[PDB]
Enzyme design. Structure first.
Site, PDB file in Angstrom:
ATOM      1  N   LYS A   1       0.995  -1.060   0.177  1.00 56.86           N
ATOM      2  CA  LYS A   1      -0.222  -0.114  -0.197  1.00 56.86           C
ATOM      3  C   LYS A   1       0.621   1.854  -0.009  1.00 56.86           C
ATOM      4  CE  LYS A   1      -1.788  -1.791   3.308  1.00 56.86           C
ATOM      5  NZ  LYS A   1      -0.713  -2.414   3.991  1.00 56.86           N
ATOM      6  N   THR A   2       1.416   1.115   1.108  1.00 53.31           N
ATOM      7  CA  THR A   2       2.713   2.080   0.909  1.00 53.31           C
ATOM      8  C   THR A   2       3.424   2.587  -0.417  1.00 53.31           C
ATOM      9  OG1 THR A   2       3.387   1.950   2.749  1.00 53.31           O
ATOM     10  CG2 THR A   2       4.430   3.597   1.733  1.00 53.31           C
TER      11      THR A   2
ATOM     12  N   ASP B   1       1.493   7.318   6.761  1.00 52.72           N
ATOM     13  CA  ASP B   1       1.197   5.879   7.229  1.00 52.72           C
ATOM     14  C   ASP B   1       1.250   4.786   8.197  1.00 52.72           C
ATOM     15  OD1 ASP B   1       2.594   5.639   4.517  1.00 52.72           O
ATOM     16  OD2 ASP B   1       4.387   4.757   5.036  1.00 52.72           O
ATOM     17  N   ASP B   2       0.932   4.013   8.120  1.00 54.80           N
ATOM     18  CA  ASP B   2       0.922   2.769   9.609  1.00 54.80           C
ATOM     19  C   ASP B   2       0.263   3.844  10.581  1.00 54.80           C
ATOM     20  OD1 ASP B   2       3.117   0.163   9.564  1.00 54.80           O
ATOM     21  OD2 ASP B   2       2.014   0.509   8.040  1.00 54.80           O
TER      22      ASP B   2
ATOM     23  N   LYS C   1      -9.240  18.337   9.944  1.00 54.10           N
ATOM     24  CA  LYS C   1     -11.009  18.898   9.283  1.00 54.10           C
ATOM     25  C   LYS C   1     -10.668  20.398  10.001  1.00 54.10           C
ATOM     26  CE  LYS C   1     -14.324  17.677  11.737  1.00 54.10           C
ATOM     27  NZ  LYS C   1     -13.548  18.942  12.925  1.00 54.10           N
TER      28      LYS C   1
ATOM     29  N   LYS D   1       4.730  -9.014  -1.640  1.00 54.86           N
ATOM     30  CA  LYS D   1       6.382  -8.305  -0.725  1.00 54.86           C
ATOM     31  C   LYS D   1       6.136 -10.551  -0.440  1.00 54.86           C
ATOM     32  CE  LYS D   1       7.954  -6.117   2.634  1.00 54.86           C
ATOM     33  NZ  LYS D   1       7.379  -5.985   4.125  1.00 54.86           N
TER      34      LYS D   1
END
Ligand code: ATP
Ligand code: ATP
Ligand code: ADP
Lengths: 533, 209
Positions: free
Chosen positions: A342-343, A396-397, A424, A501
């Site tokens: 995803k990264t 990330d993560d 927001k 991976k």
């Protein structure tokens, strides 16, 4: 007080065309009018100003230029952190020594004294809001009192001017910003196109005068290419270009037969600018090309339709963020099973976006930090992101950033609340932003009522058919035709569920055996691994 | 003259426009003193810093012959999270003590709240302090949706007629800000495929009360 030996052109400041006109009209419009009228009106002079903005955009230059323009004496430059001391009564003495000459000359030459200028740097490192609750006083309550008493006290001074410079204008006291004390505020921002042209002209005036430039050096191009360069990183570019030109000339002759006159002609500089721009200067508010190697290690390779779908969705979101005006803030979340890469896709979207500002926030640089430090780091990144006409930030993560662990459950609340509040808060007027997030456990985020803050969700799937696995192997290019056919016969059943991976790790591991026993080990590992969710 | 202090709470579902209505009610009162205490200026603060900031705002408000203070997003101030639950007790006690403290003699005040979770606030015995509450609803009909579309002025006549047929035969439970987001997200397609995407997004979003 003023003499005709000053002209605006000679000063050498480019891009501050209003931050100077307004200042001159307001602060210094009573130091130049004939004394008779000023005395008849009976109006006092302004006693200082405050300058704030990013670091390295030409604030000290302006202060010194004002000092020279007003025929003042030598400014007393000071540094905020270098006034404090650990003894009982030493800081106040240092704060009190600056106002000595003005006091001495005010009581001797009457009302015909010169003009003394005092400059403070990082003025917010000493003066902070004073506590109110009894027993809640800060450790620097005495410095602020001394400064306030000196600037405007019971004994009047009418021959002084105080300039303050700071980057965080929201921590300064509120009794130090009222008309009578520091009372004029201006902002120095990053230069724009017509502000990056003037600086380059000013800095290459010397080369043009001394006849060193080439015949193909075009300045419109150099103005266009540099997008978020601060004023202090264009002189560096110019000097680096000239230095590399000199180095090329010197090493050439030693191992070249140019000739002295030929060398002099070669001293001209045309492409050194481009090369140095490429590999010499690293901006602070600009895109970074050194991180995408750390997160895209093996590049994006296609193995199906989902890759195209995800990339197209990212493109559409980028277009919407760029064009629309009713919604200047957008968000999106990428979620999927572990080891699905995803990264990499987030980084690819960010890098193909073509935005002036791009940054990545990750926990790799936050080992051992306490929650408060993590909050400070996140806030600093977002504050730096709020200083451009376009931008994009990647988080990330998220689960690792919250310190989550299934037992308990246990996590940190301060970081969660900071993150839920930063999603927001719209940027200043006329600017746009885009935030991307990546996680593997969407349900836990759903429980934390953190999933409806994001404006959209995108799914990153996993390999689900044999033909896709065979095509991925073909793209990687490891196994030969006969071995590929053997694998295809063995695994024709479409019951594969593996991450891109883990697949790379498996292929690397299986290549540590003799050529005879290669397919067997790979098939054994694939069968041993999970074959369904 | 019997009641120099008043309070009121605006509550409703998420994405409904509570802060805008509170600000518009505050702007049209012509009170010499007006201020807003929001939680986006308190990022990273601990409990005591939040307490001090709130106390300072109210202390300043106590020096004018008229006043009006707005407290928005009450649940973000308390640091609430359903897992647990967890929150800050000190800030809650400070707020519950400040909600019923009259100013010095002769001066007047007014406090306006905001929140999307009324039940949680009721569990802590906080709706007892507020004098009264108001309800801000969502869009709950096709006619109101058509009126909103016309007032925003995005889709032309024929597309409006196309939308009318597929919408009037059902209900709708979309907020007002989310409506702007959907309209903006739909207009990024080619001229032909704009209405279809809008209808698909609206159908996906729509849910029972
Ligand atoms: N189509 C692809 N999509 C994603 N990554 C790919 C693709 N093709 C090759 N890769 C490589 O796969 C690796 C992706 O690993 P990455 O760190 O993004 O995984 P992840 O899913 O974020 O990991 P984790 O399980 O730790 O959350 C990178 O080396 C990337 O180059
Ligand atoms: N009639 C209306 N009532 C309220 N807001 C409106 C109206 N018409 C347009 N708007 C706009 O809709 C947006 C409403 O967003 P707002 O921040 O007020 O929502 P909110 O209720 O505070 O949201 P949240 O649930 O996220 O706290 C604002 O831009 C407001 O200007
Ligand atoms: N508007 C400008 N015009 C020309 N040069 C500038 C300008 N702003 C910054 N500079 C460059 O910045 C350098 C010094 O900046 P500096 O005084 O350190 O900024 P700051 O005081 O904000 O730290 C000078 O060498 C100067 O050439």
């Amino acid at each position: 007080i003023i003499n005709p030996d000053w002209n605006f052109e000679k000063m050498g400041i480019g891009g501050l065309d209003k931050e100077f006109s307004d200042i001159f009209r307001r602060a210094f419009a009573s130091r130049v009018f004939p004394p008779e009228i000023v005395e008849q009106m009976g109006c006092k002079h302004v006693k200082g100003i405050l300058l704030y903005g990013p670091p390295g955009c030409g604030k000290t230059l302006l202060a010194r230029q004002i000092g020279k323009m007003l025929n003042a004496r030598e400014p007393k430059v000071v540094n905020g952190p270098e006034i404090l001391n650990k003894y009982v009564g030493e800081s106040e003495a240092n704060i009190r020594k600056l106002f000595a000459d003005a006091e001495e000359e005010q009581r001797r030459l009457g009302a015909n004294s010169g003009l003394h200028i005092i400059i403070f740097d990082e003025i917010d490192a000493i003066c902070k809001q004073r506590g109110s609750m009894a027993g809640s006083t800060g450790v620097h309550d005495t410095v602020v009192n001394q400064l306030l008493s000196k600037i405007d006290g019971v004994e009047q001074l009418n021959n002084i001017l105080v300039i303050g410079m700071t980057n965080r204008p929201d921590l300064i006291d509120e009794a130090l910003l009222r008309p009578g004390r520091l009372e004029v505020k201006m902002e120095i921002g990053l230069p724009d196109e017509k502000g990056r042209l003037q600086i380059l002209h000013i800095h290459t005036a010397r080369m043009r005068g001394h006849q060193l430039l080439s015949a193909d050096v075009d300045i419109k191009e150099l103005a266009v290419e540099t997008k978020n360069f601060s004023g202090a990183e264009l002189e560096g570019l110019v000097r680096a270009a000239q230095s590399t030109a000199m180095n090329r000339h010197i090493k050439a002759s030693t191992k070249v037969e140019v000739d002295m006159e030929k060398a002099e002609s070669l001293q001209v500089t045309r492409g050194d600018f481009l090369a140095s721009l490429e590999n010499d200067i690293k901006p602070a508010f600009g895109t970074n090309q050194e991180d995408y190697a750390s997160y895209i290690m093996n590049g994006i390779i296609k193995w199906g339709d989902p890759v195209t779908r995800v990339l197209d969705d990212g493109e559409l979101l980028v277009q919407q963020t760029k064009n629309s005006d009713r919604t200047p803030l957008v968000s999106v979340l990428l979620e999927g099973p572990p080891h699905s890469g995803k990264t990499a896709l987030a980084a690819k979207i960010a890098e193909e976006s073509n935005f002036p500002f791009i940054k990545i926030c990750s926990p790799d640089k936050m080992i051992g930090f306490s929650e408060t430090a993590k909050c400070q780091a996140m806030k600093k990144i977002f504050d730096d992101a709020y200083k451009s006409q376009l931008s994009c930030v990647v988080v990330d993560d998220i689960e690792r950033l919250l310190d989550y662990v299934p037992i308990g459950p246990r996590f940190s609340n301060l970081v969660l609340q900071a993150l839920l509040v930063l999603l927001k808060k719209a940027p200043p007027q006329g600017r746009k932003l885009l935030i991307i997030g990546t996680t593997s456990r969407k349900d836990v985020l759903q429980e934390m009522e953190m999933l409806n803050a994001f404006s959209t969700t995108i799914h990153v799937p996993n390999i689900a058919t044999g033909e896709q696995l065979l095509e991925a192997l073909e793209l990687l290019g490891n196994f030969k035709d006969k071995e590929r056919t053997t694998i295809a016969q063995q695994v024709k059943g479409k019951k594969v569920w593996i991450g891109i991976k883990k697949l790379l790790m498996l292929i690397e591991m299986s290549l540590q055996m003799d050529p005879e026993y290669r397919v067997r080990k790979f098939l054994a590992l694939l069968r041993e691994e999970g074959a369904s969710p």
